[PDB]
């Protein structure tokens, strides 16, 4: 395989902390205690004899109405991926019934309402009962196995009941993020051809009202196939209701029994459609492979144990909510959080009040949330307990070291593992991530592939695989995995052309990646944490702090590069405040400012004054881009479609060259 | 003080089959104790797997409860009621009589084999599939007491359709109301009925009702009499001509245990009692076997109507599930004369008889010359269903129909319990005239003071009858009105099932059913007696 | 009398042994496991056949059939009961509690074992366009079409009409219906617009699968043009899926008509299988011809019958390459191109050309190119090639062949010996097969490794078939050898047709009522002194009316449809204008002239054609009979030879 045999120790690696060593009374990790223990198990899941491992894990992890015989078949070329094809199962049975039969009063969902005082625990019994009522309502509307049902719901716990009610009867749910405009909701409702929509009267988030039902009425004026709308009374405030079409959730459910049989679904029966954010692409996922993928990743990537309380702060309208709020945790039979507020409502301490109130054991959030909390100050977090946490997760954009260390220092008090996850709607479940009890982390690196994932780097100019470490190119996967998306709804040609045609024989993620000298994977390039100039270890944060002391400086970002004289050299990008008016003199003046603070050896090799730093629409400084420009790769920077002002990159290249 | 011990015909003597449970109260209590309490899953799991044939085995025995009405039994299992009432007995002995069809005119009677019943059932099922009937669709049935009514019931069950039987004596308005409630698109009925020498204009009433039932698209009409009736082109087709085009076999739909089997509306806003498949079928099969001590060659005669729950459970589902012979009696107790019941018993050698106290009192007041000179020795067990039988009728039943040689079985149950809830097991329990005696397997009943809400422990107590735990054949909801289901049976005495009937235990623990409970309004957490307010 | 088990015996009308002689052709070395060829499944003599066959009928046959069902097919749910029902009411059941899928057994399970193995040898009309279609490719195309059909709302139990020529996608269309539980109804792609309309309307399908054009023998078949003509009288059809076989310009109706490749390109290349009960209908196949009879076949029993016959009658082995040169529009293509061979997981041929295009060497070029191991064709093809000369075959290799099959009609000695001498070079077994659409699979045939053959004899019944001969005048079975009568079967067999679609009464009256207790094949048969079975051919008189060959029986069939007619008899006679003219003699029932004659003629024109309308229709008291219509007499009376039992005198009076 392209993976290392061992990873030598260094000061750039953060080894699993004691809470991930089975110390201090915490559970012993599922995989541990070192890199070798990861690669030993991973090797069983790919290559020649991997069928045996997947067959056993499939039968151990999920309950089946009918056993499977074949483990896998098909491939990328024609998009006929199959996993466990002869088997039958039901996603609601595996996420609800089987746990309800074992421990009905166990909490399935921690519902943290927008207002803290309205939060409560929802048991597996209560969740199963509401799921069965809604399922029965859908059947009364004529919903059949294979019918699409659109869901336009905010982050209330009943959204899980809506998802699983569709899965329970074999319907295909299509969740629409509850912040979407009427046009985006319309486009998704029409493409899936649903006749039924499940929505709410209003949403509540950050103390503000979301006029879901008003937006629905506007969209449905251009959705002629929709005949039934089920409306949850989230707020009870007055909203328009169309006679016949619109019915109240509580009034319909009260008419129905609180149990409903499960439809026996084929492994490859479609479980849901999820349209990409933005003609949108309906990503289609099967039942068995997707369910197994989410169950195994949650268990192993977050080291989940039977009594854990998992807090994913995402939205069910996106794939992260599908896989790591609803399906992954409930399949494992643990407690999962549905978080309805924002990270700063009522104050920026909300996340941490939440963790300490429920004693959450894992937290899964996005760098954009961490960036918001970083701006609000340390006082909102530093005096909390938070010791119930063992694993801190990050998902979304590539995370920069400064945010990583803030997350590590304050959310984890340096006692949690940071699992940086890479995946896509189309992968179904986490694709590259450290196993927190085995893998030593680097700030900004996803590390090593998950079970079933055999990834490699391809030179896009030649199409050939790059062998060895310290290589960089585009990321591809060599073989199908259980939770891979199976098609694009009614547009299979687009599925093949987008993912399978660019590099025949491979799955094309669409992202650039680098594999560093130790074999660690870096999505969209390597980012610098600490740079070693002439034997001095200097953190980008240390240098940037010295630069900002100059009152004229607004923002700064420093990156490193190999240097024939000092080993590695520091390159600093600096933007001045509007209240400032020679360029060379300022650069010399800034270097002295660094020398006075840190030392005569810490002066950056180059200081570039630029109008603005390159950022994405989320505000993330693109330090990886800057690193490549310094390395001379300004003509190999990638699509760069995420940037806010794409001219800034061109300005940076001119200054550097 | 009367106490009648199991008589010789129920002691394994005179070549009669030995009773399944016997010989005394201790033999009943020994088995019953296995069916209630915290360790009863073993017994029920075993009885479910031995009594019924399953396509898919179950894992969970029971779950859910009264509070929210999420009662589950054998949830992961699949089965088919038509397979268990027809196919499996056809495969064993196709020529065995499934139905003794006693027509309104005695000379038009005949035996209907399992083979004939299965083939007609299959033909009808194929017709329903050609009409577009799918698993889960409701089908209304408006049929009189001819043997094809069973084929109609079991045709719906065979394909997973939900049949809704409407008593063939109902008015157009009552039939209209029940057809529209279930929203069925297909109706099965007859051109005419015949009962007591008089013609029942079923099709004329149907045409009146369907002018106000816009959802009905297909009507299947049996030629019971062949007399001229109005037929609507397209909508109405003849049963025999439709079945003549269809094959004589039809595959069975694999049904989940909790899939609805049928809706039965209350006698009368009609209330649709819904029963699922496995639990109901198991309950009717076990009660018939044990309450009536039914053995493979027995000939069971329930003199009820398939339009009521008694006919659902103890003409069709219970007896046919056991593979024995069941009776479809199309006449009255006194046509052509008041000897009709007793002519029937001797002509077919009925082994058990299940009738209503009203018919017994009727025949008692017609004189004993109509019964006293019959044979009737084929009988072993005489059952009574309905209001509790008054002692005077009990003794007439015992003296003349049984000749003091049969066990008398008074039964207590309701449409909502699915199967017999309290009754003496004929080979074990010494009976008291007018007493239901002791609860059936899976039934754990108690008496509560209607005011305090508390259990009256001990004996010589009287109050409201309640059940502590769900049983397999309990009704699962009221069709599209689950809130009425909870409010009627589950909210009056939280934690229990409220039968709605008064009851008393005597010094020996025998139960005595004491008529309907004085309606008690619950005014914002206060239970009020309508009788006390009237007093004030 | 053969022992089936220790102490158990079966009493059958078949011999116990067949003595050797020089008129019998014993299995040749290629069928003796010599020269590296596979050892036969049943062998080496008659005794080995009767020993196994006796287990499949008679006392303990349930055990044998249960094991073969579980060995031959993959089941989602096992069965409990082996067989039930019977002829009287048409409630035949086999393996009723079991569930399976025909597409899973013909595709998925073989694709999972060896995806690159060739499923179909597609011999295109033009040789240069022939190629091998793997199980992978076939499964992918089957799943795409299945997904397309589901998008049209096709559900389990819905009929789907198929009007496809002999391109390999025809198998994908068949199996796509089987995969989702739909009932396919294949219509021979040579049928007229009227014949297609009648079958599309009777099965009430809402979906039709066809092609833009067909290609056969260098000629184009305007399938889509014929479809457009037929669908103007097919109101239930809403979706037509059109395969681009040629890509040349054809009409397309917006909305109704969609291209196969464009629809399939939108769909995934995998599709789950519907779990089907053994007795769920698999397909409708309409008999060739007034009112067509839709023969319905179930799933499990039919599939097992085709699987076992293909394996044992042709001694197929895992890597064999089976070449059935029939058409998928007929039962022989259903059973021995698609279902039988693919169920066995072997390679099967889809032959799109004729036996003489581009030359009469096509069959033999085919065998030598693909190394075909068995060949299955019709006596009309063998006779045709025989007339084209020996040079086209005598210098080919053909040594890959082991078994040569014949189906369709009695094979005559000249054809049998030509087939044996040149196609087989006297080194193949000749298997002469008898069966019908209604039997599902071969009913009487020699097992090639056990039975010594006689040219023209089907020989002995297949597994599960217990057949006998009945005197049609008495209804009683004829005991012993050297007997002649009508062929009947004594008990149901797994692949027997279960009904006639929406006409079960016609099913019972046609097959189960004529000889109660038996299945009536409708064919004459004889058992010779050695016990070998010989099937009698059908009789057909053909007259030449205005250059068209017209059968007398067809006209009689059209005339008798009028329920007032009791009997009818049509004869031909010289006519100065049409060459020969049609003269119909008609007798009416007691439950009944100018208008009747005109009405009967119109009915004949509608069914057969305006050229078949009788020139004269004679209403007579009774047709002249002996014991058998005297058609010779009627011809002479019409021709004016009345100068060469009283009804005959009236007939002459009526005619003149
Ligand atoms: C980041 N995204 C999208 C996503 C996910 C992915 C990967 C392919 C899967 O790719 N994109 C998430 O689903 C999300 C997961 C978690 C927390 C948040 C969040 C919560 C509150 C909050 C902010 C973010 C900004 C301030 O308040 C979001
Ligand atoms: C008694 N009932 C109702 C019932 C049943 C129940 C049980 C709680 C479920 O509760 N109520 C029956 O179904 C019945 C069963 C049997 C015979 C008869 C009958 C027949 C002819 C006849 C008379 C009675 C009066 C004179 O003519 C009726
Ligand atoms: C013989 N038939 C009909 C049939 C079959 C049956 C049996 C009841 C099932 O009953 N009838 C076939 O399907 C057929 C099978 C094979 C080859 C041919 C063929 C091909 C080309 C060709 C000719 C014949 C004449 C010259 O060109 C035909
Ligand atoms: Cl395995």
Short mmCIF file of N, CA and C in Angstrom, two decimals, chain B residues 53 55-56 83 87-88 90-91 95 115-116 118-119 122-123 126 129-131 134 158 243-254, chain C residues 77-78 80-81 83-86 89-93 96-99 155-156 158 275 277 279-281 498-505:
data_model
loop_
_atom_site.label_atom_id
_atom_site.label_comp_id
_atom_site.label_asym_id
_atom_site.label_seq_id
_atom_site.Cartn_x
_atom_site.Cartn_y
_atom_site.Cartn_z
N UNK B 53 -48.10 -21.05 11.23
CA UNK B 53 -46.99 -21.15 10.30
C UNK B 53 -46.54 -19.76 9.89
N UNK B 55 -43.81 -17.21 7.64
CA UNK B 55 -42.84 -17.06 6.57
C UNK B 55 -41.50 -16.60 7.12
N UNK B 56 -41.52 -15.65 8.06
CA UNK B 56 -40.34 -15.18 8.76
C UNK B 56 -40.58 -15.29 10.25
N UNK B 83 -53.11 -18.34 4.53
CA UNK B 83 -52.29 -19.54 4.52
C UNK B 83 -52.58 -20.41 5.73
N UNK B 87 -54.52 -22.90 3.14
CA UNK B 87 -53.51 -23.66 2.39
C UNK B 87 -52.96 -24.83 3.19
N UNK B 88 -52.53 -24.57 4.43
CA UNK B 88 -51.81 -25.60 5.17
C UNK B 88 -52.70 -26.80 5.47
N UNK B 90 -55.44 -27.60 3.46
CA UNK B 90 -55.58 -28.17 2.13
C UNK B 90 -54.42 -29.10 1.80
N UNK B 91 -53.19 -28.68 2.10
CA UNK B 91 -52.03 -29.51 1.78
C UNK B 91 -52.07 -30.82 2.56
N UNK B 95 -59.82 -32.97 1.09
CA UNK B 95 -61.24 -33.31 1.08
C UNK B 95 -61.91 -33.10 2.44
N UNK B 115 -60.53 -27.81 -0.01
CA UNK B 115 -60.14 -27.59 -1.40
C UNK B 115 -61.06 -26.59 -2.08
N UNK B 116 -62.38 -26.80 -1.98
CA UNK B 116 -63.32 -25.88 -2.60
C UNK B 116 -63.21 -24.48 -2.01
N UNK B 118 -60.56 -23.04 -0.60
CA UNK B 118 -59.31 -22.41 -1.01
C UNK B 118 -59.37 -21.94 -2.45
N UNK B 119 -59.90 -22.77 -3.35
CA UNK B 119 -59.98 -22.38 -4.75
C UNK B 119 -60.87 -21.16 -4.94
N UNK B 122 -59.06 -18.14 -3.68
CA UNK B 122 -58.02 -17.70 -4.61
C UNK B 122 -58.62 -16.97 -5.81
N UNK B 123 -59.69 -17.53 -6.40
CA UNK B 123 -60.34 -16.86 -7.52
C UNK B 123 -60.75 -15.44 -7.14
N UNK B 126 -57.76 -13.17 -6.91
CA UNK B 126 -57.30 -12.78 -8.23
C UNK B 126 -58.21 -11.70 -8.83
N UNK B 129 -57.26 -8.43 -7.20
CA UNK B 129 -56.01 -7.91 -7.76
C UNK B 129 -56.24 -7.31 -9.14
N UNK B 130 -57.15 -7.89 -9.93
CA UNK B 130 -57.47 -7.31 -11.23
C UNK B 130 -58.18 -5.97 -11.09
N UNK B 131 -58.88 -5.75 -9.97
CA UNK B 131 -59.49 -4.45 -9.70
C UNK B 131 -58.49 -3.42 -9.20
N UNK B 134 -54.54 -3.42 -3.52
CA UNK B 134 -53.17 -3.62 -3.10
C UNK B 134 -53.12 -3.86 -1.60
N UNK B 158 -55.62 -12.77 2.10
CA UNK B 158 -54.61 -13.45 1.31
C UNK B 158 -53.70 -12.45 0.60
N UNK B 243 -64.93 -14.70 -11.39
CA UNK B 243 -64.07 -15.77 -10.92
C UNK B 243 -63.81 -16.82 -11.99
N UNK B 244 -64.70 -16.94 -12.98
CA UNK B 244 -64.52 -17.93 -14.03
C UNK B 244 -63.32 -17.62 -14.92
N UNK B 245 -62.89 -16.36 -14.96
CA UNK B 245 -61.76 -15.94 -15.77
C UNK B 245 -60.43 -16.07 -15.04
N UNK B 246 -60.46 -16.24 -13.73
CA UNK B 246 -59.25 -16.18 -12.93
C UNK B 246 -58.74 -17.58 -12.60
N UNK B 247 -57.44 -17.72 -12.35
CA UNK B 247 -56.91 -19.02 -11.93
C UNK B 247 -57.44 -19.41 -10.56
N UNK B 248 -57.37 -20.70 -10.27
CA UNK B 248 -57.83 -21.25 -9.01
C UNK B 248 -56.76 -21.25 -7.92
N UNK B 249 -55.60 -20.65 -8.18
CA UNK B 249 -54.59 -20.43 -7.15
C UNK B 249 -54.10 -19.00 -7.23
N UNK B 250 -53.72 -18.46 -6.07
CA UNK B 250 -53.21 -17.11 -5.96
C UNK B 250 -52.17 -17.11 -4.85
N UNK B 251 -50.99 -16.53 -5.06
CA UNK B 251 -49.98 -16.52 -4.00
C UNK B 251 -50.42 -15.70 -2.80
N UNK B 252 -49.85 -16.03 -1.64
CA UNK B 252 -50.13 -15.32 -0.40
C UNK B 252 -49.18 -14.14 -0.23
N UNK B 253 -49.73 -12.99 0.14
CA UNK B 253 -48.89 -11.84 0.48
C UNK B 253 -48.26 -12.06 1.85
N UNK B 254 -46.97 -11.77 1.95
CA UNK B 254 -46.25 -11.93 3.21
C UNK B 254 -46.52 -10.72 4.08
N UNK C 77 -36.43 -17.23 -0.32
CA UNK C 77 -37.13 -17.96 0.72
C UNK C 77 -37.33 -19.40 0.26
N UNK C 78 -36.99 -20.35 1.12
CA UNK C 78 -37.17 -21.75 0.79
C UNK C 78 -38.66 -22.08 0.69
N UNK C 80 -41.71 -25.13 1.31
CA UNK C 80 -42.07 -26.26 2.14
C UNK C 80 -42.79 -27.34 1.35
N UNK C 81 -43.85 -26.96 0.64
CA UNK C 81 -44.63 -27.87 -0.18
C UNK C 81 -44.00 -27.99 -1.56
N UNK C 83 -45.53 -29.85 -4.39
CA UNK C 83 -46.55 -29.73 -5.42
C UNK C 83 -47.93 -29.78 -4.80
N UNK C 84 -48.90 -29.18 -5.50
CA UNK C 84 -50.30 -29.25 -5.11
C UNK C 84 -51.15 -28.87 -6.31
N UNK C 85 -52.46 -29.10 -6.19
CA UNK C 85 -53.38 -28.78 -7.25
C UNK C 85 -53.33 -29.80 -8.37
N UNK C 86 -54.07 -29.50 -9.44
CA UNK C 86 -54.16 -30.45 -10.53
C UNK C 86 -54.91 -29.89 -11.72
N UNK C 89 -59.23 -28.15 -11.88
CA UNK C 89 -59.59 -26.77 -11.64
C UNK C 89 -58.51 -25.79 -12.07
N UNK C 90 -57.37 -26.28 -12.54
CA UNK C 90 -56.28 -25.42 -12.95
C UNK C 90 -55.72 -24.63 -11.78
N UNK C 91 -55.38 -25.33 -10.70
CA UNK C 91 -54.76 -24.73 -9.52
C UNK C 91 -53.39 -25.35 -9.27
N UNK C 92 -52.65 -25.61 -10.35
CA UNK C 92 -51.34 -26.25 -10.24
C UNK C 92 -50.40 -25.37 -9.44
N UNK C 93 -49.72 -25.97 -8.46
CA UNK C 93 -48.77 -25.27 -7.61
C UNK C 93 -47.47 -26.06 -7.53
N UNK C 96 -44.77 -23.57 -3.67
CA UNK C 96 -45.55 -22.33 -3.52
C UNK C 96 -45.02 -21.35 -2.48
N UNK C 97 -44.52 -21.82 -1.34
CA UNK C 97 -44.05 -20.90 -0.31
C UNK C 97 -42.71 -20.26 -0.64
N UNK C 98 -42.02 -20.73 -1.67
CA UNK C 98 -40.71 -20.20 -1.97
C UNK C 98 -40.77 -18.85 -2.68
N UNK C 99 -39.67 -18.11 -2.55
CA UNK C 99 -39.50 -16.87 -3.30
C UNK C 99 -38.14 -16.88 -3.99
N UNK C 155 -45.15 -1.69 -12.09
CA UNK C 155 -45.16 -2.33 -10.79
C UNK C 155 -45.21 -3.84 -10.96
N UNK C 156 -44.87 -4.54 -9.88
CA UNK C 156 -45.05 -5.98 -9.81
C UNK C 156 -46.45 -6.37 -10.28
N UNK C 158 -47.63 -5.91 -13.43
CA UNK C 158 -48.03 -5.20 -14.64
C UNK C 158 -47.50 -5.90 -15.88
N UNK C 275 -38.55 -9.72 -4.87
CA UNK C 275 -38.73 -11.06 -4.34
C UNK C 275 -40.07 -11.60 -4.80
N UNK C 277 -42.89 -14.68 -5.56
CA UNK C 277 -43.36 -16.00 -5.18
C UNK C 277 -43.23 -16.97 -6.35
N UNK C 279 -45.26 -18.88 -7.69
CA UNK C 279 -46.42 -18.92 -8.57
C UNK C 279 -46.81 -17.56 -9.12
N UNK C 280 -46.06 -16.51 -8.82
CA UNK C 280 -46.29 -15.24 -9.49
C UNK C 280 -46.07 -15.43 -10.99
N UNK C 281 -46.89 -14.82 -11.84
CA UNK C 281 -46.68 -14.97 -13.29
C UNK C 281 -45.37 -14.35 -13.73
N UNK C 498 -50.08 -22.22 -16.40
CA UNK C 498 -51.00 -22.17 -15.28
C UNK C 498 -52.39 -21.67 -15.65
N UNK C 499 -52.50 -20.84 -16.68
CA UNK C 499 -53.80 -20.35 -17.12
C UNK C 499 -53.66 -19.77 -18.52
N UNK C 500 -54.78 -19.29 -19.05
CA UNK C 500 -54.81 -18.40 -20.20
C UNK C 500 -55.21 -17.03 -19.68
N UNK C 501 -54.44 -16.00 -20.03
CA UNK C 501 -54.55 -14.72 -19.35
C UNK C 501 -55.99 -14.19 -19.40
N UNK C 502 -56.60 -14.06 -18.22
CA UNK C 502 -57.97 -13.56 -18.07
C UNK C 502 -58.99 -14.41 -18.81
N UNK C 503 -58.68 -15.69 -19.03
CA UNK C 503 -59.60 -16.60 -19.71
C UNK C 503 -59.36 -18.02 -19.20
N UNK C 504 -59.46 -18.20 -17.89
CA UNK C 504 -59.20 -19.50 -17.29
C UNK C 504 -60.17 -20.56 -17.80
N UNK C 505 -61.40 -20.17 -18.16
CA UNK C 505 -62.35 -21.14 -18.70
C UNK C 505 -61.84 -21.73 -20.01
#
